[PDB]
């Protein structure tokens, strides 16, 4: 079963955690598969395999994106891997929602659920989130 | 363990309803409104949508597009003088691909609509005369397009 | 060791519990368990090479390749002009023939 | 040198087919 | 067509399939340029028109090293384009110092008899020194260049052995892995190597157009061929053709 | 070649060879991948680790980010079969 | 009936000989290496990524 | 140093005695390069006698 | 009588040893040129660069191949779907280096088999028969055309057609299974059922008809000698065969009408082959078979495997190893 | 050449000439038999197959 | 290579014309019920 | 991938592929400059998002080096991940992909 111990994920940089409701899991999976799945299926990046979505890659990024708040901030303002340049014109985001029409109907809860799905997947599948075709 | 009846959910109306795998839900398993029963997203203009419509960023982007498009349009007479038609056809579609979007987004009053229509017709004529290899008509159309875009930006 | 059911098998070195410690990589670009990196050495006891030890990577790799087929022997490959592919013993030909006949 | 054997076998089969088609027992 | 100004007047749909894209342009005039400082040769094009391979032939009761003609087995994919470099003057002479561009193209030629000889036609890392200080009819320059390997380290031979990837032994013959010496007789084919070659080119200018800053002429070149990852002895190739460049 | 001595410096260890390693080897040093590594892997051979500071066009930021990780670098002999593939080596 | 010995010998000594038979042999090697780990779970096969045979790119 | 009479050829001498000197492979019996051997080469004659 | 009338009378004559007809005017030259080119190329052709990467592959007997491994290599990948006749090459050597003979053979051969179908109909018409044998023959023609022409058209290159050799077909099948997941397409299942059922029905019909022979030879004469060319005897003494089939299985299932029996015999394999040819033609446009990878999960969310996942592992192993030097980017589009 | 868009692959006068010669030669042979056909309203028939001689 | 093209075109047009004009010569009446 | 590698700092005109033929750019059998790889068979393509970079003899090196617009990048990224591949039950992708997308 999906207990509460396995639904506990880190929210901010200090280290505080939270418990995701069972409905948030379903909403996050649905929204992720609908919006991200074309390019980020299985936790990999198709158009740039050097930057994945596995926890290790998220941890060695500059603004550090291994928690809910950093993921939401990235979705509101993307940057490069070193956090120096903005890439809002070549990546979907709220800032550039006038270019990508699929981001014009997203609320804060939607971003929270998507980030929760991304954070939750490694604890469930393990070494298959961002692993590739070998697994 | 020893004995437990499995969970049941009949079409989402007789059973749990939210079991991570239901199908044929059409909503009714979340505390939110959707665009339609066949949709996953909500309404675009809703009160809690993070994206506005017509904020400062959009206007700045469109105006930058228009200014750089004017700068790009100022190159065609040289191409026509050198009889390089492929350059004429490529310049009107390389950077200026977003000019139609910017112009249609920034036009509200009827006179702006008329100016936009005239500018679009002028550039279409310029491209046609470039692909037909006629220098005089192409040069005249390029001058007309430059003048029309300058007028439209002035009217902003 | 190479199972009798395969024809080509990778070279892998494991410890007393089954955890890999070295191998011969197929892609030498981001390998982590190469013999050069780990630094494996080989010693010989008994037989013709009694008491000798080797420490350089190439000889260790050669002996590791040889050791996945079982014990290592010295052969005379010129008297009959041997090719290099294994063959079957009289225990197999008899079975094949008489089973097909039945 | 085995190419000769292969060619001979194939041409022999073709000859057999030719003789079967054109020198055949009358069905009557 | 023949000049750049005529070529720029055609459309892509009008050139596709004709074979004009593999040709080199022509220059009209006899003037002088004289490069200032910070000049760069841009848009260089080199087109070979004859190929020959060094061999041993019999003329009359004797054998000599003669260059025999060969036929191109591939198709019109052998012209170098877009080469750029930086010009300078040392003691009144011009030096080219090639930098970038499409400066390599594989080619295969067939010798009388049936043998196929592949090679990598290139001018990579070229330094050419002239005999004068201005671009005029009669100007000449030439120098050495470096020839890389035909196949890189990621190539796999039909048995799955490569340079930086693949097997390191002949897995189809497990009976060669016994004794103090294993497959030592296959070491040459199991150990792939990648070494650089060398070449030489000589160019001469014939036409100069000052109002367009263009030059053109002929060239003669020679280099070494493919080595099959260090398993065969390379041959020697000789080529001749024309060239075009712009000093803008 | 069958035997390559410096195989551990290609990205499988804590030391990276400046003359033969691919750009992916720098992805495990934070704040260095898309800006400084691209400049490092597209310039000529270095006779020493100190030679990387003479690259024409290095902004300051790249200089101190390289100074932070200088202790993880080394410069060995150039192998042409490895140095030619430093931007894309076919691994994805 | 797996191999043709003469073709294997020539391919071993000449790294330019190629037929469809060698291609099929390589395909068989790929099948074995990528299938054995999960097809026989009782053997506890462990193959690191650096050991699995593979071509360029994909 | 390796002429045709040292390789055991028996019918080739009678072919080259009357004029045949070129082959479809691009070589000639005297030592040359052939661009277009034509119909009557060392192979056309064989195919003709066969037909 | 004009000369043209006499020529027409000879062409459509039924007195010839082999019927010519007007479809023969197309059938004979094309098939003969295809046969000649195929024999010459299979014996003595030089290696061909099939993948466009300057890596030629040998396929002729004179270059070190046996009957099993020899083939005629498809054209080069650089050519694509472009027409490549002999006169469009700079020399014959270049034509042979780029896999020229493949296009010639396949094109003249497809025209030949279409004319063969037409000729079958034409002789049926001239003899006073019913005109539906060539409809039955249309299924193998459909399959051969499907592979040889339709697959290259969909994939965009002649180099993806089936090689004219024995192990070339094995290579074709393995790569096709790796890339399109056949064996899960229902049309392939229909084709397999068609061939298996055809063999079963053929064996049943042969056994039933042969068992019900009437005694006219005694011992020292092959039973085949009892039949005379022109003898009148329906092809089964009913009581025997009918009772045998009614007792062997459920009695209500027994074909007592010969017309229906033979119609079913004709119908089954032809429909199966039609369906499998259409399956190949549709998969030529990337409409693959069923995909059930990672479809069963537990309550927590972990994946429980099935046999489809093992098939997927085999497919991955085949995929990562084919055309090793040809790809530069992650996706095999 | 190869990718150009000539009608029927015709790039020279001789090709057109030989095509014309072929169609016309067989046409003349056919005319030698069917060149006396008339359109008068008594050569027609009322049926499915033209059995009216020639 | 042009002469080969000319010969092949001649052969193809000859046989195709034979086919075309053969089917126009009152073919439906060539049946055993004439 | 040409755009990505060029942005990383590569000189995408002189790069050599594994076969020695050219990783990104090469020549068609008639001379025109085309994209490299297995896509050499599809060199006849003409699309509105790729024509602005074509000259009278194929792709233009000067335009490619320093005149590529972000909208072309967006179009290419969108089209690469929506290729016409899929299965009967509408999974989408190559035949060895997992069940995440629903697209044919
Ligand atoms: C009339 C047509 C005759 C040929 C026209 C002139 C050819 C001119 C020429 O320079 O022609 C060039 C080619 C020569 O081909 C060369 O053929 C060589 C084959 O030689 C090989 O063999 C040589 C040894 O013989 C070399 O040693 C090396 O192995 C090679 C090359 O390999 C290449 O094939 C190519 O360079 O000839 C040809 O055009 C080939 C001739 C046509 C093929 C014959 C097929 C005809 C079959 C009809 C059967 C009808 C039967 C029923 C009746
Ligand atoms: C007798 C055997 C046939 C019966 C088949 C069973 C019927 C119900 C199952 C079925 O059909 O399938 C179930 C679907 C309904 O299922 C929906 O099917 C959808 C199909 O995806 C489509 O929708 C998706 C998003 O909506 C994507 O856009 C995807 O690209 C697009 O194809 C998705 O899978 C939905 O999740 C799922 O709910 O019914 C359908 O499709 C409804 C339409 C069926 C008739 C369509 C005519 C057949 C197609 C023309 C012939 C094509 C020929 C192919 C070559 C032969
Ligand atoms: C079922 C019967 C059978 C079986 C199992 C074998 C088995 C074998 N034979 Mg054999 N053989 C047989 C019948 C059989 N033979 C018959 C009937 C003949 C006569 C034609 C031969 C003639 C024969 C020869 C001439 C040779 C063998 C050889 C061999 C060995 C390889 C193998 C042990 C070979 C061998 O290694 O023998 C030393 C060998 O040279 N056999
Ligand atoms: C009078 C007839 C005659 C003569 C003088 C020769 C003479 C020769 N033959 Mg010969 N041969 C002949 C008839 C003849 N052959 C016939 C009829 C056949 C067919 C059975 C052969 C088949 C034949 C072969 C297969 C070979 C010779 C070879 C040779 C040479 C040893 C020598 C030049 C040999 C040689 O050196 O050829 C290169 C060789 O290998 N011959
Ligand atoms: C159009 C016909 C034709 C042509 C042009 C050729 C051409 C050729 N043949 Mg071929 N051949 C042919 C038909 C033909 N053949 C036929 C039909 C046969 C079957 C019998 C053969 C059997 C054949 C063989 C077996 C051989 C050739 C060979 C050759 C080549 C050398 C010829 C040679 O040296 O002869 C020389 C001929 C002679 C010396 C004959 C002399 C004639 C005698 C002296 C007549 C004397 C009696 C006379 C009636 C006296 C009364 C007349 C007087 C009153 C004026 C040459 C390319 C040779 C070759 O190299 O093949 C690869 C070869 O070995 N041919
Ligand atoms: C029934 C006779 C016949 C037919 C239909 C073909 C058909 C073909 N041959 Mg072939 N051939 C034949 C007999 C025939 N062959 C014979 C007897 C020989 C020996 C001399 C050859 C020798 C030969 C060679 C050497 C080559 C061909 C080639 C070809 C192809 C292109 C030919 C072309 O461009 O024609 C052009 C014809 C026309 C433009 C006239 C057609 C006009 C009518 C209206 C047709 C319209 C049909 C339309 C689709 C509806 C084509 C598949 C070539 C090939 O396969 O290259 C890959 C090639 O290189 N043939
Ligand atoms: C037991 C397992 C099994 C079985 C029974 C089958 C059965 C079949 N598979 Mg199959 N397959 C299997 C496993 C199996 N497969 C596996 C495991 C794989 C994955 C590796 C495949 C991959 C696969 C592919 C990729 C294809 C098949 C195809 C087929 C069909 C063959 C079509 C055919 O022969 O008729 C067709 C008949 C012909 C092609 C003959 C045409 C004859 C021409 C017209 C005339 C020839 C005349 C000749 C040249 C001259 C005669 C000589 C003269 C002297 C008389 C058949 C239904 C094929 C198919 O569906 O066909 C469309 C196909 O393309 N399978
Ligand atoms: C009848 C006379 C025919 C004639 O002389 O053809 C003249 C042809 C010449 O044939 C030409 O010859 C050239 C070189 O001589 C090239 O080989 C040409 O390909 C070939 O066509 O020769 C014969 O047909 C031999 C006739 C033997 C009697
Ligand atoms: C309908 C059927 C009516 C015809 C009945 C006759 C059927 C006879 C069977 C015909 C087969 C023989 C045809 C071979 C022709 C051939 O290969 O041409 C081969 C040539 C190609 O020709 C190549 O062209 C290249 C172009 O760069 C180069 O020039 C090459 O040198 C040249 O060989 O193709 C054509 O001629 C196709 C033209 C026909 C297509 C238009 C048909 C017009 C009517 C359309 C309605 C039907 C659709
Ligand atoms: C008749 C049509 C069949 C052709 C004859 C088949 C038999 C001869 O074919 C030949 O194939 C190869 C051609 O390179 C030969 O291979 C070798 O032949 C010679 C043997 O003396 C060697 O000196 C040559 O280096 C080499 O050509 C084979 O030894 C032989 O088998
Ligand atoms: O050629 Mn036959 O197989 Ca249709 O995918 Mn891409 O190309 Mn090649 O690889 Mn995979
Ligand atoms: Cl690719
Ligand atoms: Fe019967």
Structure description:
The structure is cut from a larger assembly and holds twelve protein chains of eleven kinds. Chain D has one helix at 2-22. Chain D has 28 residues and is mostly helical. The longest helix of chain D is centred in the middle third of the chain and has 21 residues, at 2-22. Chain F has helices at residues 33-40, 60-69, 80-83; strands spanning 16-17, 73-74. The longest helix of chain F has 10 residues, at 60-69. The radius of gyration of chain F is 13 Å and the shape is globular. With 54 residues, chain J is an all-alpha fold. Chain J has one helix and no strands. Chain J has one helix spanning 13-34. Chain J starts with 12 loop residues before the first helix and ends in a 20-residue tail after the last helix. The I-L interface holds I 52-55, 77-81, 156-157, 159, 178-181, 185-186, 285-291, 293-295, 312, 315-316, 319, 323, 325-329, 331-333 and L 1, 17-21, 23, 28-29, 36-38, 40-44, 80, 83-89, 91, 94-99, 104. β1 (287-288) of chain I pairs parallel with β5 (86-87) of chain L. It is classed as photosynthesis.
Strand content of chain J: under 5%
Structural class of chain G: mainly alpha
Distance between the termini of chain J: 47 Å
The main β sheet of chain J shows up as: none
Q: Count all strands of chain J and give the number.
A: 0
Order of helical and strand elements of chain J: H
Distance from N terminus to C terminus of chain G (CA atoms, Å) equals 31 Å
Question: What sort of overall outline of chain J do the alpha carbons produce when their principal axes are compared?
Answer: elongated
Sheet/helix structural class of chain J: mainly alpha
Rounded Rg of chain G: 14 Å
Order of helices and strands of chain G: HH
Instruction: Work out the strand percent of chain G.
Output: under 5%
State the assembly state of the protein chains.
Answer: part of a larger assembly
Secondary structure topology:
The structure is cut from a larger assembly and holds twelve protein chains of eleven kinds.
Chain E: H1 4-7, H2 12-15, E1 40-58, E2 63-69, E3 71-72, E4 80-86, E5 88-89, E6 94-95, E7 98-102, E8 104-110, E9 116-122, E10 129-130, E11 140-145, H3 187-190, E12 199-209, E13 214-224, E14 236-246
Antiparallel strand pairs in E: 1-2, 1-4, 1-14, 3-8, 4-7, 5-6, 8-9, 10-11, 11-12, 12-13, 13-14
Chain F: E1 16-17, H1 33-40, H2 60-69, E2 73-74, H3 80-83
Parallel strand pairs in F: 1-2
Chain L: H1 2-8, E1 25-27, E2 33-35, E3 54-55, E4 58-59, H2 61-66, H3 70-80, E5 86-87
Antiparallel strand pairs in L: 1-2, 3-4
Bound molecules: digalactosyl diacyl glycerol (dgdg) (2 copies), chlorophyll A (5 copies), 1,2-distearoyl-monogalactosyl-diglyceride (2 copies), dodecyl-alpha-D-maltoside, CA-MN4-O5 cluster, chloride ion (CL) and 1 more.
